[PDB]
Ligand binder design. Sequence first.
Ligand SMILES: [Pr+3]
Ligand SMILES: [Pr+3]
Lengths: 151, 154
Amino acid sequence: DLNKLLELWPHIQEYQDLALKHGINDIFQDNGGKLLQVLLITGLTVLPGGNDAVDNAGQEYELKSINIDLTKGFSTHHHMNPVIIAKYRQVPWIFAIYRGIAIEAIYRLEPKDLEFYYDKWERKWYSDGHKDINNPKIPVKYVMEHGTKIY
Amino acid sequence: SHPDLNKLLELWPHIQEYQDLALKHGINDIFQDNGGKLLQVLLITGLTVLPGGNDAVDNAGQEYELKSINIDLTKGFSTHHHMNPVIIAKYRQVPWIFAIYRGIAIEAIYRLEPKDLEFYYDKWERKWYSDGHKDINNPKIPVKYVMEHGTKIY
Ligand SMILES: [Pr+3]
Ligand SMILES: [Pr+3]
């Protein structure tokens, strides 16, 4: 096994080198090694931790990821309210689907594809007497059904 | 879209092998919680990780306390956030493995026996009773101290 490390490490360092070039300081923390795949495939640039990335034309995106083996719904925001929703409405969303550490598929939804949920939650907020919804999920079936498959 | 994508494809088979290797050693995700870093320590020391006190055990049943730091971000190993005589008593029973990383690569690994750490244990204990039975907030062990008193395994 220690032999395996000597044979595998050189490639690992090269992967980290590639990660650094794209603004990922440590591939072994906070899904660093996973985010990199999405960035390279999609050609986006990461933004400082709101919107998570931007393309060469200056279009900002909201990025959501999921481990298909652990859950079946993308998370949004723990304290969902009209302020956040207003922000969400302005940008297209990138949905990344992983299986383990590997990227399996990537979908893009335009704001109009998410209005259904935006309107629903927004009405929810006012009807329940101004109560923040706890991280409402977006079914993977929904994204696969309404988004464009980039990968 | 990125030309760098090609590099990714060439490298991927090896990253997956690394993850495969990690699974056999009980690390679920190399890209989370320093998974890929911890694996290096396990493979070099031949230790087995322990499910979330003591953090690893060797083939002879000897348990160890394992601490690590990124020499670039700090020069002191953390201990415990609410340490008192009880935590100290647990610490005194096992040797400690100190892992030093530089970025994502291990730089050095040291082992200290309880005898090498009594200097700190006694001081922390006394302080607990002195300051009026109050838990000490994560006192640190300087890296220089571990380098001078420990056995360099890597
Ligand atoms: Pr975001
Ligand atoms: Pr521990």
